[model samples]
Target: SHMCDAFVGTWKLVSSENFDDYMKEVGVGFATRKVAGMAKPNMIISVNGDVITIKSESTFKNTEISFILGQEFDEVTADDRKVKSTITLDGGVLVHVQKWDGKSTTIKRKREDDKLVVECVMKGVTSTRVYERA
Candidate 1:
């Protein structure tokens, strides 16, 4: 179904649900999370064959992550440190695996009813944040 192709284009970060808690769970600092909360990150996606690259651009910093559709590749944590892992796809959903130093974390994302829902999981914590289409 070309799930990678489905993510091609620019998407603005609108309102986020539980984003604060999610960042907190990820060990995000108060001031940083506050800035992130107000940030309208722009998402840019590029698909080449089975490879997919997603860029989250904002006024502060731009983050770029890439992975293949079926294969696994290192998934860098958005926090910039504390984890390294892999990302893949399960059917239509994007799956991210974060190796938190030694432990592992998983994040899943999908679009429901025109909204993008990102589910982040680590250890005993799980957070779900939704982003609307721009």
Candidate 2:
């Protein structure tokens, strides 16, 4: 169970870089961005067979999405936007791509020095979030 061993756990947000810019690029409002910037979201990952579920929880809101690897699925983002998303695991990195309203975003998640590093990119803006096991 590589998937279970690698990702099945709770991870707490440690730090984030350029998240506000990224949120703005995604069309988040000023009020939501202010709240989101102050909130630390915890990501809980679970794997059942080939299905992977990720739950992101914060004081502002909570978001959960489940999908199988290599399959595309419809998803509602944490910001309440609808998108078509797909996730894939390659070389120990989990890559997620989302498309909505003719725009695309990509998020790459991997472990580095015992920390989960999530890099999100959209419209030339990149945000990095570091998380530690909880």
Every candidate's lDDT: 0.71, 0.91
Can you write out model 2's per-residue Cα lDDT over 7-118, one digit (the tens) per residue? 7799999999999999999998999889889989999999888889999999989999999988999998878889999999888899999999999999999988889999
RMSD of 2: 1.1
Please provide, for model 1 over 24-89, each residue's C-alpha lDDT reduced to its tens digit, 9 standing for 90 to 100: 777779888877777778777778877788888887668887776555555544566555656777
lDDT of 2 at 134: 89
Prediction 2 TM-score vs. true: 0.95
lDDT, model 2 = 0.91
Those runs of model 2 whose alpha carbons end farther than 4 Å from true positions after fitting are none
Clashing pairs in 2: none
